[PDB]
Structures are given as structure tokens and as C-alpha cells.
Ligand binder design. Structure first.
Ligand SMILES: [Mg+2]
Ligand SMILES: [Mg+2]
Ligand SMILES: [Mg+2]
Ligand SMILES: [Mg+2]
Ligand SMILES: [Mg+2]
Ligand SMILES: [Mg+2]
Ligand SMILES: [Mg+2]
Ligand SMILES: [Zn+2]
Lengths: 97, 152, 129, 196, 201, 80
RNA sequence: AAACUAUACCGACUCGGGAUCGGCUGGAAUAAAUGUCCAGUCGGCACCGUAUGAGAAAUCAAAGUCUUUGGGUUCUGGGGGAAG
């Protein structure tokens, strides 16, 4: 039962847009990739993990997946789970052999 | 939850009906045969509930209504053996009376006086129901002396 | 003693969204709870949901992402003439710009907006934003 | 074999065929004697099921009059097995079921009993469509667009009987009931305390 | 199960990486396979292998290695992790005494600002994790069944009790990081013995 | 990893009968063979009071608290 | 009565951990039982951690799910004394 989660990412995020179709929003916060919360200016503990892409020779491609996690999630100790699953849905985990 | 115990009364005694409504496959009794047994038991002066138990333990009949389509009391009604006063109320009054009995003799027993108060309370509380739902004669009352001669 | 099944299911829901939970088992359930969910889903908040038939009342699993800031019930279900809409949208909702107050009407259960477009009103159920 | 129907007045080719079948059976098999004595039919519908298989399969739905129902359910396996033999299609049985309207109450003194209600009747139809077996479980899915969806959990052991019938059932149910129905096979899970 | 992977699991088993104490932080419920008659808690090794590789991919990801920081308290992983930092060109906390403020206080002498943090025992090294929490710094931890996962981003289930275990974990991670960095062939065996990382008495 | 909709069997078996999804009971029915007269009878798992085989009147089961005690050489199979 | 958890009752939902009293369900050991141990679970009295929940705080797994203010219902207070 994945459908809503997928549709959620289907379209891009937009700050405030007036009728003249400007972007009014000073910056577009990162949102957590698990809980989907907003990533604070002030968040002491919010974290962005970059994980490397691997060619069949073991080579790093220089390509990176960035997984953002938010304070409440790491803090509750959900992180170690969240990440794994985020890597499943992106097709990067488990690691093939 | 448990009625008229405030504070801690609250717990779950079991019964959980299975999902399959159809009667079980291993069961070879015709619904008619069942109605026969249940009525025999009934005429022997048993309770719809006690009949239920008997059919379940001894006779391999798990749920009588899922077999017949008629619950036990309705069967009793159609087939004419009827428990005049509902088994329900019947037991409550039997009880309230056993407490009357014991209480006339030990007059210093306070807990049993209070328990009696509770039980009679439930009895009236059930009377109202069975009255508005036409299962009891409209002028029927529980009194000490009236109900003591009332088939209990 | 259970009063207002919509209230049970709604509060349990909000709780689980708030705890960052990925889904909710919801019990027991009614027409109204399912229509309310069909409404929130249609309107973008919850995701797909599944209904489970136990022979009695029912159970309902709800996929949530996270959107719902709050979703409440108002009890008692007051009387909300078309005149009073202003009140309730100002009092209940975060801003003019979004969020809905759901109502029962003789034309059915509606976003207050659906009620201006249907021109009716009168019985308030709950809200979500 | 107009004896096998309640109208007896007119029968289609399909109903002639079924009638003659039940005749052949009440004659051949002493097994089914009593059972076919008591079974009267109301209606018979025929359906065509065309799928990606490129197989066009004829499927027959026969409507037993309500008073024959108990006997029908008693004879179900034997009956469908022999009837699938006597015609090159597959068969299904239902009870003939009236539906009383919500807001047109005809008589002041009649309360429409829930036994005949749009829902309850349609559901019962499903129960009949599976007839030799039974639902282990049933769940409804709400898609994101607002389509409702059914999916049904079935006894493992009955796979043999019900495998091919599935498409036919979904076609029939989509037709009459307007419902999307999916199936699953699980094992029937009994929770026992066994003493080893 | 390639020959490579078989060699990996063999090494891991031999090093007894899968033996845990008896407590289960429920947070670990997923990483533990067996619970023994002797109370010994046994880790699923596949999870270990997987996580090692994942970790290596996080470390390969930081552009400049000195922005990865290994932190160890206990005596076993002092040796092992200082060797790790050696081959991995990253920073080591050598003094077992982690100074409060090391991540937080830009004024301290030990002051660091890694992009990624790696700790040997989340329970022992806890102050490091807590500090990382103040700075937006993600953490790869070596984790026994008794270890708290609060503020831990990558859990590698281990036995962080023994030298054998800790050392060969840091070793295997190092070798895989080497591989990903093209400092080493994928097919080729590594001439550095695990025995270096062991703690000498 | 956990899904409420596809709960794991060994787990539900461990749960209390009211806390499962299908809310299914723990009782069984059993065919019991009298040690003496060799009659077969049906007995509820948690059956109340006592059971005597109809042929020889000997004692099959004894009541408790949810267990029935099958007495002596009486052999049984669960029906399902 | 400081008749005191100075903490209304029925009902949901939100963390983790051992232990305890009463039922039950399997399993194991023995010297084979109204006794041990192990694993479940239902209900009690509590405790220990912990909350990115609450609070003026002391503190509170409710004293949480409250300006993101409405599950049901009784009761009580509105500066201090005068004054029960
Ligand atoms: Mg209760
Ligand atoms: Mg109602
Ligand atoms: Mg025992
Ligand atoms: Mg307050
Ligand atoms: Mg605070
Ligand atoms: Mg506490
Ligand atoms: Mg208030
Ligand atoms: Zn006998």
C-alpha cells in the first residue's frame, strides 16, 4: 500500500505564488525524506547524509544520493530504520552481490 | 466497564465468534435434529444458555444459530416450550432472594446489605427494559414478597 | 462508554500523524468515518486506505504521508446556517487560504466550500488542515 | 423440462439446455434424486468472458428458487461437477433475490427487511459465486481517485476448484453488482493450542 | 554468496562479530537473529555485511577524508581505529578522554567540524554522539545489542566488546573504502593483516 | 517494515484473541475415544463440567479453568 | 478527619524495560508436583528509564493527545480577611 507516498513526490514543491505567478517565498526549506517535516533554520540536529553510487567495478561514480532526516526522527532513534527504507525505495539497498 | 463498579471494574472475559458464519464441515446433524435435542433439553427445564452449553460440549454444535438460523430462545418460542420469565431476570431475582434469606438471619452483616442494594438496583434496571420491550407484563413489579412467589 | 465514533477515529488518526507514524489501524468505523476519509483523501491529505471486514463494526488501515496539521471533530454537531459559515471558517481554520470544515447537509457530507457551491448547510462534523 | 422453471411459459435455448440437463440427471444419478426433486429454477443467464488469454469462455449463471436453496447448497459440489460435464461451459448457482427500494415504501405496515437490500443481496451473490467454497476474509480498498475496490481471501485447499472460475466471477460481479473484485489464496490459519 | 562475500562472512564469523551481550535495546530487535539458551544474543550477519558496505559508501561520499572522524573510547578500538584513520586518511580521537565541547566549542583545542562521525560504542562514546546532535552531524556507529540508537544514522550491528570483532569490522570497512576509492581492485586481496588492528597487551 | 494489513502469523497467534485482526478464538473440538468401550465422542476444548461416554458411562473428561483433562487412555484428534 | 494520590467517572490514543499478584496457553528439567524454570497473554498494585508531550516550577506516562482551543457526564473557585 504505497500509493500516496509516491504521488506525494510526483510534482515539485512551490513556495507562495501570487496571481502574477511570482515565487514569493524567501527560501524553500528542505523537507525530511521520512516524516516529511520542514527543515528549520534553527534545527540543531537535522542532517543530510550523502551516499555514493557504485559501478560494477566497485568504482564510485561521484554520484550521490542525499537523504535528509529531521531532528525528531534521528532523536527518536528511527533514523537507522528510516534511512534503510529510503534506500530500498530508491533501489539502492540491500547491496547486491 | 463492569456495571456499577466504579474505579477499577474493567476487564475482558472471553468469547470471540469465528469468521466463518457457515456451520462447520465436520458437523453432520440436521438443523431439525438439533431443534429436537434443544427442545427435549428445554422440556427437561433447562436454560437457553444451559442448552447452548450442552449442545456445544457434548454434541459438537459450536453455534446453534449459524446452523439453524434461529437463535435458541426463538426456537424455544416457536416450538412452544418457553421460559416464562426471562432466564436473565430469573437469576437476578434468585440471587436477590438468596441474599434476603441469608440477611434475615444475620442482621449485622453490612456487606451483604449493600450487595443486596446493588442486585435489586440491577433488577429494577432490567425490569424497565423488559417492560418497554414488551417481554414483561406491564404492571409486573419486583417486591420482596411479590417476587418471592413469582416463580422464584 | 463510546460516544461519537468519528471522534475516536479522528483523534487516533491525528495522534499517529503527529508521532510520525506511517499508518493507522482504526477501529471501530462507520459510514461517516469512511466518507470523512474519502473526503480527506480526495482533498489530498491522507493517502490510500483499506477497509477490513470483521463481521461486526469494522477496522480501517490508513496510509498517511504527513500533511494533516490537525484533524478534529466538533461535538456537539452544531447547527450551521449559511449565515454562520464565516464564523466557523474564521474560528476553526488556520487561514483563509486552505483547510476545510466538513458538514452534513441534506445534500450530503461536504467541504464547507462544496456547501457554498451547493448553497446549503447546517450540520457541522469536523475539520482538517 | 418446463417443470424445472417457475414460469414454465417461455424458455431460451440456454434454459432449454439446462432444463434438459437436470432431466438427464434426475434420471441418471440416484445420488441427486431428492435434491433435483426439490430444485426449481427461476431464471438462467448466459455470459461471455473474453480476456487477454484470447480464450472466449462461455459461463452460465443459474438462479435457484429460494425454497430450493438449502437443498442446493447441500448438493452443490456434486451438482456443479456434473453440470460442467453436461455442457462445455462452467456453471454457477444463485438464489433468486428481490430488492426493496430505499425511499419507495409501498405499504405503511411493511418494514423492508434487511435480507433484501441492495448491498446484502449483492454480497450474498458473491457468496454464491464461490459456492462450493467460502470467503476466508474480505477487504475493501479505497484508491486515490475514489474508486472502491474489493479483494477477497480464499482457502488454499479450494484452489483446484476455483482457479479458472475467478475471471468468470469478476466478469459476472462487475456486470450484475458493478463491483471490482480481486482474489487471494492464503492458507486457512487456525490458532490452536496443540499439546505435543 | 560470491567467493568474495563468502570470504567476508567467514572473516566476520571467525572474528566472532555476531556475539552480543544479553540485553536487547528493542531498537535492535531487527538486527538480532537468535536468542540462545545461554542468553547469548546472536546477530544476523547479513545485516552486518550490508551495513559495513553502506557505511563505506557514506565515507566514500565525503570529498575530503579528514572531514570523516573516527571516535573511540575503549582500549580495543584505540589501536584498531587509529590504524583505520591511518589507512582512511581521516581524523582520530586518540586520547580516550573526549573533551566536552570538542564539536560544540569552537574555542577548544581539540575542536573539530567533521562532515561525518564514526563511533565504536554508542554507549561509551555517547558524549560524542550528543555533541554531534548539536551540530547537524550524521553518525555511523558500531552497535551491540545493549547500545542506544538515539541520534545514530547508520547502525552496523557488531560485537563492540572484543578486539577481534571491532578490529576486523574497522578493517573490512577500510578495505571496502579502499575499493570504492579505486585505491584497490575489487577482485584483489589486501596484504594488510587484520592482526595489526588487534590491541596488543 | 511492519504492515498492519499483513500481520505475521506467529505474532497473531501470540496475541490475545480479541487483539487479532480477524479476532479469532483459541478453542477446538476433538474426537475422543473412550478407553473402555471404544466409542467416539465430540468434546469442546474448554468444556464445562464433566463428560461420560454414552455407551459404557465411563469418564472421559474433567473440567477446569479452560483446560479439559482428558482422563487415562482416551485418545483424541482435533477436528478442523 | 490532612475521610489524601490534597489529583471526579465512563471511553479512545500516544514511548521503552524488567519485576510483581490472580487466571489461562504452550514448552523444559528433576527426586514427576496444589512445586521449579521458560515463552506467551488477560486483568491488578507499582516501579525504573525516557518524551521533539505538559507545566510557574516541584514535577507528570498523565498532570500528555489545549489559541492547531469541542469524545460523554455530575461537582467545585473567581484577591485577602471578615467567617464556615
Ligand atoms: Mg473494556
Ligand atoms: Mg448513532
Ligand atoms: Mg503449564
Ligand atoms: Mg493548565
Ligand atoms: Mg518545556
Ligand atoms: Mg516517570
Ligand atoms: Mg478547554
Ligand atoms: Zn465408553
Amino acid at each position: 500500500m504505497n500509493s500516496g507516498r509516491a504521488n506525494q513526490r510526483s510534482k515539485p514543491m512551490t513556495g507562495l505564488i501570487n496571481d502574477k505567478k511570482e515565487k514569493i517565498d524567501a527560501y524553500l526549506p528542505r523537507k525530511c525524506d521520512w516524516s516529511n517535516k520542514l527543515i528549520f533554520s534553527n534545527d540543531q540536529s537535522s542532517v543530510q547524509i550523502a551516499i555514493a553510487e557504485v559501478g560494477e567495478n566497485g568504482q564510485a561514480t561521484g554520484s550521490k544520493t542525499n537523504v535528509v532526516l529531521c531532528g525528531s526522527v534521528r532523536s527518536k532513534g528511527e533514523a537507522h530504520i528510516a534511512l534503510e527504507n529510503i534506500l530500498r525505495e530508491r533501489g539502492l539497498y540491500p547491496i547486491q552481490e | 466497564g463492569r456495571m456499577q463498579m466504579k474505579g477499577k471494574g474493567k476487564g475482558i472475559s472471553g468469547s470471540a465468534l469465528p469468521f466463518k458464519r457457515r456451520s462447520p464441515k465436520w458437523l453432520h446433524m440436521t438443523p431439525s435434529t438439533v431443534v429436537d435435542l434443544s427442545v427435549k433439553l428445554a422440556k427437561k427445564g433447562l436454560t437457553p444458555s444451559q442448552i447452548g452449553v450442552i449442545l456445544r460440549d457434548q454434541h459438537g454444535i459450536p453455534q446453534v444459530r449459524f446452523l439453524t438460523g434461529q437463535k435458541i430462545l426463538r426456537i424455544l418460542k416457536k416450538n412452544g416450550c418457553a421460559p416464562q420469565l426471562p432466564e436473565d431476570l430469573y437469576f437476578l431475582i434468585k440471587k436477590a432472594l438468596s441474599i434476603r434469606k441469608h440477611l434475615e438471619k444475620n442482621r449485622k452483616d453490612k456487606d451483604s446489605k449493600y450487595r443486596l442494594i446493588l442486585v435489586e438496583s440491577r433488577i429494577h434496571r432490567l425490569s424497565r427494559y423488559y417492560k418497554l420491550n414488551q417481554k414483561l407484563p406491564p404492571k409486573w413489579k419486583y417486591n420482596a414478597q411479590t417476587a418471592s412467589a413469582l416463580v422464584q | 462508554v463510546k460516544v461519537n465514533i468519528l471522534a475516536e477515529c479522528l483523534k487516533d488518526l491525528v495522534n499517529a500523524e503527529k508521532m510520525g507514524k506511517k499508518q493507522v489501524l482504526l477501529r471501530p468505523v462507520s459510514k461517516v468515518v469512511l466518507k470523512f476519509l474519502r473526503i480527506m483523501q480526495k482533498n489530498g491529505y491522507i493517502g490510500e486506505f483499506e477497509v477490513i471486514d470483521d463481521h461486526r463494526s469494522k477496522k480501517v488501515v490508513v496510509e498517511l504521508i504527513g500533511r494533516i496539521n490537525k484533524c478534529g471533530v466538533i461535538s456537539p454537531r452544531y447547527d450551521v446556517p449559511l449565515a454562520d459559515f464565516e464564523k466557523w471558517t474564521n474560528n476553526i481554520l488556520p487561514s483563509r487560504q486552505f483547510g476545510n470544515v466538513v458538514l452534513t447537509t441534506t445534500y450530503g457530507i461536504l467541504t464547507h466550500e462544496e456547501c457554498r457551491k451547493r448553497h446549503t448547510g447546517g450540520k457541522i462534523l469536523g475539520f482538517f488542515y | 423440462a418446463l417443470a424445472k422453471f417457475h414460469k414454465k411459459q417461455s424458455l431460451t435455448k440456454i434454459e432449454e439446455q439446462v432444463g434438459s440437463a437436470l432431466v438427464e440427471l434426475q434420471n441418471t444419478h440416484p445420488d441427486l434424486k431428492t435434491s433435483l426433486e426439490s430444485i426449481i429454477l427461476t431464471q438462467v443467464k448466459e455470459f461471455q468472458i473474453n480476456k487477454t488469454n484470447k480464450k472466449a469462455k462461455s459461463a452460465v449463471l443459474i438462479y435457484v428458487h429460494f425454497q430450493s436453496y438449502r437443498v442446493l447448497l447441500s448438493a452443490a459440489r456434486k451438482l456443479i461437477i456434473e453440470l460442467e460435464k453436461k455442457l462445455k461451459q462452467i456453471v454457477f448457482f444463485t438464489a433468486q433475490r428481490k430488492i426493496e427500494s430505499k425511499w419507495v415504501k409501498e405499504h405503511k405496515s411493511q418494514q423492508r427487511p434487511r435480507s433484501r437490500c441492495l448491498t446484502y443481496v449483492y454480497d450474498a451473490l458473491l457468496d454464491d459465486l464461490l459456492l462450493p467454497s467460502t470467503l476466508i476474509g474480505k477487504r475493501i480498498r479505497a484508491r486515490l481517485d475514489g474508486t472502491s475496490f474489493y479483494r477477497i481471501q480464499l482457502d488454499q485447499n479450494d484452489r483446484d476448484f476455483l482457479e479458472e472460475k475467478l475471471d468468470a466471477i469478476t466478469h459476472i460481479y462487475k456486470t450484475v453488482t458493478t463491483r471490482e473484485v480481486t482474489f487471494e489464496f492464503k492458507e486457512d490459519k487456525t490458532f490452536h493450542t496443540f499439546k505435543k | 554468496a560470491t567467493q568474495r562475500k563468502q570470504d567476508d562472512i567467514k572473516r566476520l564469523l571467525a572474528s566472532n562479530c555476531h556475539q552480543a551481550t544479553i540485553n536487547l535495546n528493542n531498537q535492535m530487535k531487527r538486527y538480532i537473529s537468535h536468542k540462545g539458551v545461554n542468553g547469548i544474543h546472536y546477530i544476523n550477519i547479513e545485516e552486518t555485511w550490508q551495513k559495513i558496505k553502506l557505511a563505506a559508501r557514506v565515507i566514500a561520499a565525503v570529498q575530503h577524508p579528514e572531514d570523516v572522524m573516527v571516535v573511540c573510547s575503549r582500549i580495543y578500538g584505540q589501536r584498531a581505529a587509529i590504524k583505520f584513520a591511518g589507512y582512511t586518511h581521516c581524523k582520530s580521537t586518540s586520547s580516550s578522554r573526549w573533551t566536552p565541547g570538542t564539536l560544540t566549542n569552537y574555542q577548544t583545542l581539540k575542536y573539530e567540524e567533521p562532515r561525518v562521525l564514526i563511533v565504536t560504542d554508542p554507549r561509551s562514546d555517547f558524549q560524542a554522539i550528543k555533541e554531534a546532535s548539536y551540530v547537524n552531524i550524521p553518525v555511523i556507529a558500531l552497535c551491540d545489542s545493549d547500545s542506544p540508537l538515539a541520534y545514530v544514522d547508520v547502525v552496523i550491528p557488531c560485537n563492540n566488546r572484543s578486539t577481534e570483532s571491532i578490529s576486523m569490522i574497522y578493517w573490512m570497512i577500510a578495505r571496502e573504502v579502499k575499493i570504492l576509492r579505486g585505491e584497490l581492485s575489487k577482485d584483489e586481496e589486501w596484504e594488510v593483516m587484520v592482526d595489526l588492528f588487534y590491541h596488543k597487551t | 517494515e511492519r504492515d498492519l494489513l499483513n500481520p505475521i502469523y506467529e505474532e497473531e497467534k501470540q496475541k490475545n484473541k480479541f487483539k487479532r485482526l480477524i479476532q479469532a478464538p483459541n478453542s477446538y473440538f476433538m474426537d475422543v475415544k473412550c478407553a473402555q468401550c471404544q466409542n467416539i465422542q465430540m468434546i469442546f476444548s474448554n468444556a464445562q463440567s464433566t463428560i461420560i461416554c454414552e455407551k459404557c458411562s465411563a469418564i472421559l473428561c474433567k473440567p477446569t479453568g479452560g483446560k479439559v483433562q482428558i482422563q487415562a487412555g482416551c485418545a483424541f484428534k482435533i477436528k478442523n
